[PDB]
């Protein structure tokens, strides 16, 4: 992402990235303990991990989604000469 | 991670990682290329986005699981005192 953007662009991104972080709630505070709990055990059991993971589906699905909305929206702030250069770096 | 572990661990950690991190297959072209082709689109196709996220979920599941399994195999190769400070890190 270095397409010689203008002094209007970066700030428009600023409004959407603050839409990509906050409102789009990222942290469940007790599950980051769970991961710890399963790894920090001397005896490993898959089902304990299998059934923690998929509780982290609602959160990680709704994220991937929300993120794509925002990164699309920045694409749409671009110009034809800028959209060009961005597309090609993906390759 | 600077537990002051032995030469043997530094090596066992290396062959645990290369043991099953080469058991989880990394990102696939048509799932990846579309992840971004959804973004470079003219207008954010919502419905469409949800369907990629899914097609990508189960495969991603086995990649979180193997991760935790190797982090446990790594954990289970530590001793009492170093186990006490790794836990104290995240806490």
mmCIF file of C-alpha atoms in Angstrom:
data_model
loop_
_atom_site.group_PDB
_atom_site.id
_atom_site.type_symbol
_atom_site.label_atom_id
_atom_site.label_comp_id
_atom_site.label_asym_id
_atom_site.label_seq_id
_atom_site.Cartn_x
_atom_site.Cartn_y
_atom_site.Cartn_z
ATOM 1 C CA UNK A 1 0.000 0.000 0.000
ATOM 2 C CA UNK A 2 2.151 2.859 -1.376
ATOM 3 C CA UNK A 3 0.353 4.339 -4.387
ATOM 4 C CA UNK A 4 1.311 7.999 -3.847
ATOM 5 C CA UNK A 5 -2.015 8.830 -2.219
ATOM 6 C CA UNK A 6 -3.224 12.391 -1.570
ATOM 7 C CA UNK A 7 -3.708 14.428 1.604
ATOM 8 C CA UNK A 8 -7.423 13.613 1.510
ATOM 9 C CA UNK A 9 -6.963 9.828 1.300
ATOM 10 C CA UNK A 10 -4.955 8.893 4.449
ATOM 11 C CA UNK A 11 -7.528 10.694 6.624
ATOM 12 C CA UNK A 12 -10.490 8.995 4.948
ATOM 13 C CA UNK A 13 -8.708 5.733 5.761
ATOM 14 C CA UNK A 14 -8.379 7.039 9.334
ATOM 15 C CA UNK A 15 -12.195 7.088 9.662
ATOM 16 C CA UNK A 16 -12.618 3.532 8.344
ATOM 17 C CA UNK A 17 -9.738 1.955 10.281
ATOM 18 C CA UNK A 18 -11.321 3.385 13.439
ATOM 19 C CA UNK A 19 -14.378 1.575 12.070
ATOM 20 C CA UNK A 20 -12.271 -1.566 11.570
ATOM 21 C CA UNK A 21 -11.004 -1.632 15.183
ATOM 22 C CA UNK A 22 -13.473 -0.329 17.800
ATOM 23 C CA UNK A 23 -17.165 -0.981 16.944
ATOM 24 C CA UNK A 24 -16.038 -4.290 15.411
ATOM 25 C CA UNK A 25 -15.444 -5.856 18.851
ATOM 26 C CA UNK A 26 -12.227 -7.932 18.850
ATOM 27 C CA UNK A 27 -11.526 -9.354 22.339
ATOM 28 C CA UNK A 28 -13.245 -12.071 24.399
ATOM 29 C CA UNK A 29 -11.338 -11.768 27.692
ATOM 30 C CA UNK A 30 -11.645 -15.330 29.100
ATOM 31 C CA UNK A 31 -10.797 -17.446 26.027
ATOM 32 C CA UNK A 32 -7.188 -16.227 25.881
ATOM 33 C CA UNK A 33 -6.997 -17.971 29.265
ATOM 34 C CA UNK A 34 -8.492 -21.150 27.735
ATOM 35 C CA UNK A 35 -5.830 -21.425 25.002
ATOM 36 C CA UNK A 36 -3.260 -20.979 27.771
ATOM 37 C CA UNK A 37 -5.019 -23.637 29.890
ATOM 38 C CA UNK A 38 -4.949 -26.295 27.127
ATOM 39 C CA UNK A 39 -1.308 -25.664 26.146
ATOM 40 C CA UNK A 40 -0.111 -25.244 29.754
ATOM 41 C CA UNK A 41 -1.317 -28.750 30.686
ATOM 42 C CA UNK A 42 0.978 -31.766 31.064
ATOM 43 C CA UNK A 43 -1.644 -34.003 29.504
ATOM 44 C CA UNK A 44 -3.032 -32.951 26.087
ATOM 45 C CA UNK A 45 -6.671 -33.653 25.118
ATOM 46 C CA UNK A 46 -7.970 -32.680 21.604
ATOM 47 C CA UNK A 47 -11.700 -32.358 22.438
ATOM 48 C CA UNK A 48 -10.829 -29.654 25.022
ATOM 49 C CA UNK A 49 -9.135 -27.703 22.178
ATOM 50 C CA UNK A 50 -11.593 -28.822 19.422
ATOM 51 C CA UNK A 51 -14.445 -27.307 21.458
ATOM 52 C CA UNK A 52 -12.659 -24.109 22.401
ATOM 53 C CA UNK A 53 -11.675 -23.364 18.761
ATOM 54 C CA UNK A 54 -15.243 -23.388 17.367
ATOM 55 C CA UNK A 55 -16.491 -21.020 20.100
ATOM 56 C CA UNK A 56 -13.898 -18.839 18.383
ATOM 57 C CA UNK A 57 -15.821 -19.078 15.082
ATOM 58 C CA UNK A 58 -18.459 -16.411 15.728
ATOM 59 C CA UNK A 59 -15.626 -13.984 16.575
ATOM 60 C CA UNK A 60 -13.175 -14.895 13.829
ATOM 61 C CA UNK A 61 -15.854 -15.215 11.105
ATOM 62 C CA UNK A 62 -17.482 -11.835 11.857
ATOM 63 C CA UNK A 63 -13.941 -10.397 11.789
ATOM 64 C CA UNK A 64 -12.655 -11.712 8.464
ATOM 65 C CA UNK A 65 -15.968 -10.342 7.157
ATOM 66 C CA UNK A 66 -15.867 -6.859 8.727
ATOM 67 C CA UNK A 67 -12.201 -6.476 7.748
ATOM 68 C CA UNK A 68 -13.035 -7.167 4.085
ATOM 69 C CA UNK A 69 -15.765 -4.480 4.096
ATOM 70 C CA UNK A 70 -13.262 -1.863 5.292
ATOM 71 C CA UNK A 71 -10.335 -2.826 3.020
ATOM 72 C CA UNK A 72 -12.812 -2.820 0.136
ATOM 73 C CA UNK A 73 -14.013 0.649 1.208
ATOM 74 C CA UNK A 74 -10.434 2.011 1.109
ATOM 75 C CA UNK A 75 -10.088 0.497 -2.387
ATOM 76 C CA UNK A 76 -13.075 2.693 -3.294
ATOM 77 C CA UNK A 77 -11.408 5.849 -1.977
ATOM 78 C CA UNK A 78 -8.649 5.245 -4.527
ATOM 79 C CA UNK A 79 -8.351 6.585 -8.078
ATOM 80 C CA UNK A 80 -8.131 4.554 -11.331
ATOM 81 C CA UNK A 81 -4.370 5.250 -11.533
ATOM 82 C CA UNK A 82 -3.958 4.173 -7.891
ATOM 83 C CA UNK A 83 -6.299 1.130 -7.967
ATOM 84 C CA UNK A 84 -4.153 -0.032 -10.884
ATOM 85 C CA UNK A 85 -0.899 -0.195 -8.899
ATOM 86 C CA UNK A 86 -2.530 -1.836 -5.871
ATOM 87 C CA UNK A 87 -4.119 -4.653 -7.884
ATOM 88 C CA UNK A 88 -0.750 -5.602 -9.419
ATOM 89 C CA UNK A 89 1.188 -5.943 -6.147
ATOM 90 C CA UNK A 90 -1.154 -8.731 -4.962
ATOM 91 C CA UNK A 91 0.370 -10.958 -7.669
ATOM 92 C CA UNK B 1 10.811 -17.030 24.967
ATOM 93 C CA UNK B 2 14.217 -16.880 26.687
ATOM 94 C CA UNK B 3 13.707 -19.459 29.478
ATOM 95 C CA UNK B 4 17.455 -20.245 29.415
ATOM 96 C CA UNK B 5 16.703 -23.720 28.035
ATOM 97 C CA UNK B 6 19.402 -26.233 27.015
ATOM 98 C CA UNK B 7 20.825 -26.908 23.529
ATOM 99 C CA UNK B 8 18.698 -30.074 23.443
ATOM 100 C CA UNK B 9 15.423 -28.145 23.826
ATOM 101 C CA UNK B 10 16.267 -25.487 21.226
ATOM 102 C CA UNK B 11 16.642 -28.520 18.928
ATOM 103 C CA UNK B 12 13.586 -30.504 20.132
ATOM 104 C CA UNK B 13 11.459 -27.376 19.677
ATOM 105 C CA UNK B 14 12.841 -27.124 16.136
ATOM 106 C CA UNK B 15 11.924 -30.719 15.200
ATOM 107 C CA UNK B 16 8.535 -30.519 16.917
ATOM 108 C CA UNK B 17 7.766 -27.455 14.773
ATOM 109 C CA UNK B 18 9.102 -29.082 11.585
ATOM 110 C CA UNK B 19 7.317 -32.205 12.844
ATOM 111 C CA UNK B 20 3.692 -31.125 12.383
ATOM 112 C CA UNK B 21 3.750 -27.518 11.041
ATOM 113 C CA UNK B 22 4.510 -29.471 7.888
ATOM 114 C CA UNK B 23 1.234 -31.297 8.618
ATOM 115 C CA UNK B 24 -0.924 -28.159 8.247
ATOM 116 C CA UNK B 25 -1.305 -27.052 4.614
ATOM 117 C CA UNK B 26 -0.810 -23.311 4.033
ATOM 118 C CA UNK B 27 -3.192 -20.986 2.102
ATOM 119 C CA UNK B 28 -4.709 -22.201 -1.235
ATOM 120 C CA UNK B 29 -4.695 -20.192 -4.505
ATOM 121 C CA UNK B 30 -8.415 -19.985 -5.425
ATOM 122 C CA UNK B 31 -9.400 -19.394 -1.792
ATOM 123 C CA UNK B 32 -6.642 -16.749 -1.465
ATOM 124 C CA UNK B 33 -6.902 -15.051 -4.893
ATOM 125 C CA UNK B 34 -10.649 -14.632 -4.336
ATOM 126 C CA UNK B 35 -10.156 -13.356 -0.760
ATOM 127 C CA UNK B 36 -8.620 -10.307 -2.454
ATOM 128 C CA UNK B 37 -10.723 -10.393 -5.647
ATOM 129 C CA UNK B 38 -13.672 -9.856 -3.313
ATOM 130 C CA UNK B 39 -11.884 -6.723 -2.103
ATOM 131 C CA UNK B 40 -10.806 -5.217 -5.459
ATOM 132 C CA UNK B 41 -14.482 -5.376 -6.503
ATOM 133 C CA UNK B 42 -16.464 -2.250 -7.442
ATOM 134 C CA UNK B 43 -18.924 -2.573 -4.535
ATOM 135 C CA UNK B 44 -18.598 -4.809 -1.411
ATOM 136 C CA UNK B 45 -20.525 -8.047 -2.208
ATOM 137 C CA UNK B 46 -21.566 -9.064 1.311
ATOM 138 C CA UNK B 47 -23.343 -12.400 0.754
ATOM 139 C CA UNK B 48 -20.415 -13.514 -1.443
ATOM 140 C CA UNK B 49 -17.848 -12.818 1.309
ATOM 141 C CA UNK B 50 -19.465 -15.090 3.911
ATOM 142 C CA UNK B 51 -19.149 -18.056 1.512
ATOM 143 C CA UNK B 52 -15.355 -17.831 1.188
ATOM 144 C CA UNK B 53 -14.822 -17.530 4.962
ATOM 145 C CA UNK B 54 -16.719 -20.845 5.287
ATOM 146 C CA UNK B 55 -14.978 -22.751 2.452
ATOM 147 C CA UNK B 56 -11.828 -21.777 4.373
ATOM 148 C CA UNK B 57 -12.991 -22.648 7.928
ATOM 149 C CA UNK B 58 -12.562 -26.424 8.370
ATOM 150 C CA UNK B 59 -9.053 -26.351 6.840
ATOM 151 C CA UNK B 60 -8.194 -23.480 9.204
ATOM 152 C CA UNK B 61 -9.534 -25.565 12.112
ATOM 153 C CA UNK B 62 -6.894 -28.264 11.692
ATOM 154 C CA UNK B 63 -4.265 -25.489 11.638
ATOM 155 C CA UNK B 64 -5.247 -24.109 15.026
ATOM 156 C CA UNK B 65 -5.406 -27.668 16.439
ATOM 157 C CA UNK B 66 -1.967 -28.806 15.240
ATOM 158 C CA UNK B 67 -0.637 -25.470 16.501
ATOM 159 C CA UNK B 68 -1.884 -26.198 20.023
ATOM 160 C CA UNK B 69 -0.694 -29.821 19.822
ATOM 161 C CA UNK B 70 2.899 -28.801 19.017
ATOM 162 C CA UNK B 71 2.789 -26.005 21.611
ATOM 163 C CA UNK B 72 1.833 -28.748 24.070
ATOM 164 C CA UNK B 73 4.568 -31.135 22.849
ATOM 165 C CA UNK B 74 6.929 -28.199 23.319
ATOM 166 C CA UNK B 75 5.402 -27.472 26.759
ATOM 167 C CA UNK B 76 5.644 -31.142 27.836
ATOM 168 C CA UNK B 77 9.407 -31.033 27.169
ATOM 169 C CA UNK B 78 9.998 -28.291 29.751
ATOM 170 C CA UNK B 79 10.624 -28.680 33.498
ATOM 171 C CA UNK B 80 8.977 -27.311 36.745
ATOM 172 C CA UNK B 81 10.793 -23.941 37.029
ATOM 173 C CA UNK B 82 10.742 -22.922 33.353
ATOM 174 C CA UNK B 83 7.072 -23.948 33.248
ATOM 175 C CA UNK B 84 6.431 -21.499 36.108
ATOM 176 C CA UNK B 85 7.804 -18.492 34.183
ATOM 177 C CA UNK B 86 6.249 -19.209 30.780
ATOM 178 C CA UNK B 87 2.860 -19.263 32.521
ATOM 179 C CA UNK B 88 3.764 -16.067 34.407
ATOM 180 C CA UNK B 89 4.519 -14.378 31.070
ATOM 181 C CA UNK B 90 0.946 -14.418 29.754
ATOM 182 C CA UNK B 91 -0.123 -13.669 33.343
#
